[PDB]
Chains A and B, each alone.
Chain A
Amino acid sequence: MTGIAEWYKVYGKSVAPDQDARAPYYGPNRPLWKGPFTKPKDVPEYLKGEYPGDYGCDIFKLARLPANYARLRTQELMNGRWAMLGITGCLTPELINSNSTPGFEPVWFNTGAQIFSDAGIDYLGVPGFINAHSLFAVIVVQALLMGLAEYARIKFVPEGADPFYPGGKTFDPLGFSSDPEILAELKVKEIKNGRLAMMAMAGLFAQGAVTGVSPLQNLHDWLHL
């Protein structure tokens, strides 16, 4: 129950201290996927709540069995975390410098072809940073490091913690998970921000396919300023 605890409780909790952080997001009181027009039928009788970020939106007959539901929850969480990382990493280099510094290539969907250029990939356009020029070496390092990471994920489980919420000392240095109630509220926040990032990534793909870049079409067009 570290110093970060009771600090999140006073400030970062999304509900008043008298009210618990359960009811607005769990149980029969969930906002549901059609707002005030949801009607009892559109909520499946097995999507009863009791899990983070469900709005009773199963239009196709997916889930309906606990194993499928739990699995799909796990891939949703993983895609969401990776999408948060992807969106923030796609928007950071363009924000820091939108100019085409030869070794930089700020555009997110054009940095792949930067490795084949003579200038290579120069982190922050600094000539002495990495300065990679070989795609095969990057391939090999990706394969080795991510194979080790995922093998540790799906084989080196402590056999006592959740596969996707390990917690513990190493994954929760600040000890946010001291209280189960705030833990569930934080899980709800994580799921919702992850879904927002996933839609941001999909829209980024589509708008890169149609229009040029991210800053332009947000400052060049649709926000004439």
Chain B
Amino acid sequence: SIWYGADRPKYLGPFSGETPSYLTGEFAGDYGWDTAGLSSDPETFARNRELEVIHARWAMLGALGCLTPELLAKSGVKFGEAVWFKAGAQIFSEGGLDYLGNPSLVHAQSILAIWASQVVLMGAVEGYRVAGGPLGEITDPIYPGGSFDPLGLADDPDTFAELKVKEIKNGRLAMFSMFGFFVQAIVTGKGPLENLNDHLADPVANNAWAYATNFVPG
């Protein structure tokens, strides 16, 4: 339990120095990084913790879903459109949006129906997340357990803490990756796999400096 103890590796490595007074551990992914001083209030700290974990889970899902179709298309899978920031336009295409390019799957043709279904279902599930519903009741805002851990991988509290650290670390990495995806898609104009393939060959000029001159005023 190196992370949870009063001596943890911190975000500077061995040469860390000052650690915030309130950050005594007791939380997954505690690296003593509060340079902005935003979570000084305890309730604000709890709200920011909730935001962090929800964002981490959403970003892990987003990174997986932004990488998988592109990797499949590169590997040889047929798609109507595979670029992560272009996949939304398939609903406005004549062929329609078909899962894995198969007309026998989903075969969605209207955007309004998708929007209405998403609004209704996500409203229901977020209301459940805030007030408890069919899958259980609110015990901890972030870690409900029970029906959402059916296999019981977090029965042991020590293993529970270790899994918390693992999940938060993977999630923060995924969040950083999603920010990278957004900025690279708006700068280069090609998918993450295209950028990686460009960096694979001739990395000297396949970087941000190549496009550093595209936003000069004039």
Contacts and interface: CB of A to CB of B under 8 A. Distances in A.
Q: Do chains A and B touch in the complex (CB under 8 A)?
A: yes
A134 interface: no
Nearest to B156: A169
Contacts of A127: 75-76
Contact of A175 (B74, B75, B150, B152): B152
Nearest to B71: A128
B35 to A, nearest CB: 37
B194 to A, nearest CB: 15
Contacts of B155: 2-3, 175
A2 B152 contact: yes
Contact of B76 (A3, A126, A169, A174): A126
A128 B197 CA distance: 14
A126 B151 contact: no
Interface string A143-178: 000000000000000000000000001000111000
Which of A3, A127, A174, A175 has the most B CB atoms < 10 Å from its CB? A3
Contact of A126 (B75, B152, B156, B159): B75
Nearest to B150: A3
Interface in A59-80: none
B12 interface: no
Interface in B152-170: 152-153, 155-156, 159
B77 interface: yes
A110 to B, nearest CB: 22
Name the prevailing secondary structure of the B interface residues.
Answer: loop
B75 A174 contact: no
Name the prevailing secondary structure of the A interface residues.
Answer: loop
Interface residues of B, number: 12
Contacts of A174: 151-153
Interface in B51-78: 74-77
Contact of B152 (A3, A128, A129, A169): A3
A4 interface: yes
A5 to B, nearest CB: 8
B160 to A, nearest CB: 12
B150 A128 contact: no
Contacts of B151: 3-4, 173-174
A3 B145 CA distance: 11
B150 A129 contact: no
A95 to B, nearest CB: 19
Given A4-B151, A169-B156, A174-B153, 19 more contacts: A2-B152, A2-B155, A3-B149, A3-B150, A3-B151, A3-B152, A126-B75, A126-B76, A126-B77, A127-B75, A127-B76, A128-B74, A128-B76, A129-B75, A129-B76, A169-B159, A173-B151, A174-B151, A174-B152
14 contacts: A3-B149, A3-B152, A4-B152, A126-B75, A126-B77, A127-B76, A128-B74, A128-B76, A129-B76, A173-B151, A174-B151, A174-B153, A175-B152, A175-B155
Interface of A: 2-4, 126-129, 169, 173-175
